[PDB]
Every structure is written in structure tokens, then in C-alpha cells.
Amino acid sequence: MLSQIAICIWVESTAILQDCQRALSADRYQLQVCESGEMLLEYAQTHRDQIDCLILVAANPSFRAVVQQLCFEGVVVPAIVVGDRDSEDPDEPAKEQLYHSAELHLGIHQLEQLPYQVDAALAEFLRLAPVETMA
Structure with missing residues (x-):
């Protein structure tokens, strides 16, 4: 059976x-919280498979850089992203370069679907796995 799910989140805000x-x-x-983005690399650099779902906050400036390393080393996981506009405006349609195509999105004030999203992110990642992580 499944013992537990490993989720590595990276967020510098307690809330x-x-x-x-x-x-x-x-x-x-x-849940494993990473005080930085480099720290997340070491954790995903030695247990990519042990990671069941990665949580990321686009609100960070170099956050994409940290994610690029995950994809750079080939670390691909059902990563749920937080911070997505709710308008169809073409100017900010929320690009999918924050991570791989298997990464799921979560509204900033929608923090609660992470658990249900994790199950969707896992299935969404397994079907797409191996996902395309060109960063």
C-alpha cells in the first residue's frame, strides 16, 4: 500500500x-519546508523519487530559477504552484514555465485544495511522467 506522501514546499512566509x-x-x-530555494535543490537532488508533490510560490522573484534546477537535474514531480490571475486577459494568462507541464496551479486564497490537488497532481504527473522539464 502507500505509507505516506512526501511533499517538499518552498515558502518564506509562515502563513x-x-x-x-x-x-x-x-x-x-x-511536508518539508525549505527556508530557501537552494535548500530545496539539495532535498530534491537526493530523493526526487521520494518526493510525492512539490509546493511552490510564484510570488518569489528567483523562484523560477530554483525550479529550473529541479528541471535542470531532471527532478520532476507533481508540483502545485500558487499565485495565478483569475482573468482571461491575454497579457497575463499565467505561463506554464514556472515548472513542468505536470505542475498544478492553486489560487492564492484557494489554499485548501492542496490535499485534493495533490491527488490530482500525482495522477496528472504520473500520466504525463516522464514530464518535459526543459525549464
């Missing part, structure tokens, strides 16, 4: 870290 993990509180969740 975001708490709301992102709060939803992901299932008894089978292993």
Missing part, C-alpha cells in the same frame, strides 16, 4: 507555509 501545509495535513503527508 503561506501553514495554509499550504494545513490543507496538506492528511495523516499520510510528509
Whole structure:
């Protein structure tokens, strides 16, 4: 069976870290918070497979750079992204370069679907896995 799910989130804000993990509180969740983005690389650099879902916040400036390394080393996981506009405006349609095509998106005030999203992110990533992580 499945023992637990490994989720590595990267967020420098406790509220975001708490709301992102709060939803992901299932008894089978292993949330790992990364104080930085480089720290997340070391964690994903030695257990990509052990990671079941990565949480990322686009609100960060060099966040994409940190994600590029995950894709750079080939670390691809059902990564849920936070921070997406809710307008169909073509100026900011939310590009999918934050991570790979398997990454899922989560509204900033929608912190709660992470658990259900994780299950969707896992299935969405497995079907697409291996995903295209050209960063």
C-alpha cells in the first residue's frame, strides 16, 4: 500500500507555509519546508523519487530559477504552484514555465485544495511522467 506522501514546499512566509501545509495535513503527508530555494535543490537532488508533490510560490522573484534546477537535474514531480490571475486577459494568462507541464496551479486564497490537488497532481504527473522539464 502507500505509507505516506512526501511533499517538499518552498515558502518564506509562515502563513503561506501553514495554509499550504494545513490543507496538506492528511495523516499520510510528509511536508518539508525549505527556508530557501537552494535548500530545496539539495532535498530534491537526493530523493526526487521520494518526493510525492512539490509546493511552490510564484510570488518569489528567483523562484523560477530554483525550479529550473529541479528541471535542470531532471527532478520532476507533481508540483502545485500558487499565485495565478483569475482573468482571461491575454497579457497575463499565467505561463506554464514556472515548472513542468505536470505542475498544478492553486489560487492564492484557494489554499485548501492542496490535499485534493495533490491527488490530482500525482495522477496528472504520473500520466504525463516522464514530464518535459526543459525549464
